[PDB]
């Protein structure tokens, strides 16, 4: 019903100290590891999708591709 909330957030480190959705829906201090293999991790409470800084999942916005 709530269509949830895919909250994309780019982090500097791979292991992210997440919490959850609403106060009563998590927030116990949880650390999720972002795999460079894909570039993101999701927390099924607030649906916070953490993208790794500069990862292949962070290849949006605009390309560069070097020479």
From TrEMBL:
Q: Taking every annotated instance into account, which residue ranges of this chain make up the domain Zinc finger CHCC-type?
A: 14-50
Under InterPro entries, the record lists: Znf_CHCC
Question: Would you tell me the protein name for this molecule?
Answer: Zinc finger CHCC-type domain-containing protein
- Organism expressing this protein natively: Ruegeria pomeroyi (strain ATCC 700808 / DSM 15171 / DSS-3)
């Amino acid at each position: 019903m709530t269509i949830q909330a895919p909250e994309t957030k780019i982090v500097d480190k791979s292991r992210v100290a997440c919490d959850g959705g609403e106060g009563a829906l998590g927030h116990p201090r949880v650390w999720l590891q972002i795999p460079e293999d894909t570039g993101w991790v999701e927390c099924p409470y607030c649906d916070c999708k953490y993208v790794l800084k500069g990862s292949k999942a962070d290849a949006l916005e605009h390309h560069h591709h070097h020479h």
